Amino acid sequence: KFEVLLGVYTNAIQYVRFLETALAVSCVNTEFKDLSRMTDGKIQFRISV
């Protein structure tokens, strides 16, 4: 008279990146190895009217 072990099932976490979803269209992305070295950034537009 046995008690059968019918199944051990482990869900698989699928890996998801940033460039593999459709939120990546809204922004362009650049690898920047030393970001904590950078303290602040700036862009400067020259608008001639």
Place this chain on the structure above:
Amino acid sequence: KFEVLLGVYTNAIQYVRFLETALAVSCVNTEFKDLSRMTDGKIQFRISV
């Protein structure tokens, strides 16, 4: 002067197999020859959140 016997036909009860109905899509089957020798069974799931 007579009385007639106008045929005899009996109903043929069709054999309704499990694998010919739609309720076999709701489940999946395994032929276990010896379920009398089973006291209990279990499935343990591992959910990785």
